[PDB]
Amino acid sequence: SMSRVLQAEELHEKALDPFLLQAEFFEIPMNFVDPKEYDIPGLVRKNRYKTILPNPHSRVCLTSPDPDDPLSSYINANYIRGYGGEEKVYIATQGPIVSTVADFWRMVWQEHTPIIVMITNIEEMNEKCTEYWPEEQVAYDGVEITVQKVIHTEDYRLRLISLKSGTEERGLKHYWFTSWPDQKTPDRAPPLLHLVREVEEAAQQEGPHCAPIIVHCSAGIGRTGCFIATSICCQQLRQEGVVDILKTTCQLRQDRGGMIQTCEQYQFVHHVMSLYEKQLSH
Structure with a gap:
């Protein structure tokens, strides 16, 4: 309900x-x-944090393998509206825990997700995310995941993945961002902006009516909210010539409580958008 429309x-x-x-x-x-x-x-076993839960109106419910079982159907994830309120542009979810790796892949398959954005640093793989992709190939509950290529860049690692279940094969792009800064200073903004722009381009390459893009970090609200807010505000800046980070944050919180968890994160989104505006103006 709040709004502050910012010119440059x-x-x-x-x-x-x-x-x-x-x-x-x-x-x-x-x-x-x-x-x-x-x-x-x-x-409780399916949640990293007891107080960070999916809001019921936008929760992603798993339909396989037992839709009549509320435990089997539960994942800590919400559909998130995108720019202009478009429904289901993203899914925000927690980093998988050991007991939810198969559930996560069930969600990817169910939702036809073409892109995953993972925002966890390499030193955080003991606390903030369980490594849920294989070195080559693995099957979780009937989803066969094959990593075909690893592309290492300065600002992200991209895995090209093939998903096979039955006679159907689908592609998936997994972007792993490992440059999340301890201090959210402006000189740390360029890599996040680069990731946002890369993912925006990949999403457009999926063509009309792109399926939901999964974004995750530890609890699925802090870094995830920053990534989604920045993505939305980049479209707003290009289309409208202004940014409304406050309105965007309010919209995100309606979809999943807690999106953008800290003030340092909120300020970082402003640093990123300030940088992007400078780039666009040149």
């Missing part, structure tokens, strides 16, 4: 005003979910 000059100055950024940010309700919503034996 205000955007550049806003990104460098931490006192106003924190005043604005902490006015936005988190919209977290009451745990009573998911009173199911065994459900």
Whole structure:
């Protein structure tokens, strides 16, 4: 419901005003979910954090292998609207845990997802994400995942993957961003902007009515929210010549409580958009 439409000059100055950024940010309700919503034996095992749960109206429900079982059907994931409110542009989800690797691949297959964006640093693979792709090939619950190529670039690692289940084969692009900064200073913005632009281009290459793009980080709200907000605001800047990070953050929180978890993250999105505006203007 909140909105602050930024032209270029205000955007550049806003990104460098931490006192106003924190005043604005902490006015936005988190919209977290009451745990009573998911009173199911065994459900805690499927969540990394007891208080970060999928809002029920936008939750992704797994339809295989038992849609009548609420535990089997549960994954900590929500559909996320994109630019202009387009439905189901993204799915935001937690990094898989050991017990949810197969569920994650069930979601990828169910949703026809063509692109995964993973935002976890290499030193965080003991806490913030279980390595869920194979060196060559693995099958989780009837989804056969084959890594055909690993492309290492400075700003991300891209895996080209083939998914086979039955007689059907589909491609998948897995982008792993490992450059998330400890201090969210402007000099750390270029790699994230590059990732956003690369993924935007890959999404367009999927053609009309692209299926949902899965984005994840540890809890599926902080870095994930930054990535999605930046992606939406880049389209807004190109189409409208302005950025409304506040409105975008409010929209994201409606879809999944907690999106953009910290004020440092909120400021980082402003640094990224300020950088992009400078690039576009040249």
